[PDB]
Amino acid sequence: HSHGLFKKLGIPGPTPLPFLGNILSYHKGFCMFDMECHKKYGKVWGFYDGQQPVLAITDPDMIKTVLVKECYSVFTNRRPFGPVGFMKSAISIAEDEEWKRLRSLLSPTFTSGKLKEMVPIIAQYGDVLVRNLRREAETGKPVTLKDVFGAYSMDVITSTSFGVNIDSLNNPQDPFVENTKKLLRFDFLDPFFLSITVFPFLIPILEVLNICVFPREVTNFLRKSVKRMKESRLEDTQKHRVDFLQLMIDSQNSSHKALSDLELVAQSIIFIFAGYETTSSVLSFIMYELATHPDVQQKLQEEIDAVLPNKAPPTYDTVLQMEYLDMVVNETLRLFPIAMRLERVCKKDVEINGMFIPKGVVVMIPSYALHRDPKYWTEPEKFLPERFSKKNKDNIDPYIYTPFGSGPRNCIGMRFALMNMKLALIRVLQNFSFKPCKETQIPLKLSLGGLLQPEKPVVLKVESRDGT
């Protein structure tokens, strides 16, 4: 019972129940819980995930202090979440100095140059997705976005970490894809995780039995797959394709360095885990918005048609040049910041601009809630891209709008993700128009689970701009 911590500090929040803390209030999902707390408690509030104290903060300066100012010193790590095994070394699960070192070895791998050089590969799959989407529409039936983008997301992943070039969508059974496919984002509200939240003392027991949240079935497979291609393939030299693995392999081969072949395997897997369902979900939200806002869709199409007359293949610089595109992407991320919350564990007693935060408390920034906070957004529930226009985006506080988090521990694949999604969006809109379908849910309703996603999958009628 650390359940008295918050009233002891005079910090408001919902009253916790023995053992459960406040988890039954998650019956409508993390985001609804955070919006309702924001509303009734104010700028700061506390709650308990089992016995774990969580202090939500909403003040921009405090957020910067936590995410930026005091990253290395006090708020360096995310909260532990369950049995992880060797993945304990994935950069996103790694802690303190261990994390700092991994954050160095990997920086170069995510530089624009390395990125630009990966465009041809990803772009190549944009052609594949279009080629693919061409059929699904050409046919007649509504298209289920998660699937088309799931495959596209998959294809970019494999391809950008050694030439495993597969048309994932039409090779549903290619084992290598049938495994990477299983690397889905965790729903921390499913029974298992709720149980570990209420019985955290069970994690060491699962670790000793080698029980891991990532499917060993799949982790084993890729561990071995990387092993061979890391040898078998390029252990022949002469001709390499600037993918993450190679960047990880070569980074290996000539301060703190030397990525353990196991670490490297951990990185490759986490990069997949970090980008697979995230990219696909964001693309789907965007397409939903464009379909329910024809005018925006058209305008986007006109800009694309302008920067690339007559379906001209997208390019790094060409992508960067499109502003309405950038505005549409950003607006969608404001409405659907898929991480939902940003978190940091307080490694030690501290005071940040006024309030004292005890050691061990989890400091949480409710992105979903700050993104829809009336106090900062006119008609928060509305999809209005102008919000991010050139002469308007300056009024946006970066500690309020945080779809990719902020500070030293922000999303390391952010630019890659933005690039990936735009290239895809360009290719697709540069060929089709998505319109609401009779089965299209409007307004879109969000799941009540622990992931930010539509209640029912988004399906839309897809039409080719002059397809005969």
Ligand code: HEM
């Ligand atoms: C639209 C897609 C994506 C979104 C919205 C997104 C979101 C985020 C967010 C909000 C964080 C937490 C930041 C923080 O705590 O301050 C994060 C972490 C991170 N992201 Fe992404 N991400 C996306 C895709 C990617 C992709 C494609 C990759 C990999 C190439 C990637 C790699 C990671 C990693 C490794 C971390 C952990 C970084 C660290 O702790 O040092 N993400 N992401």
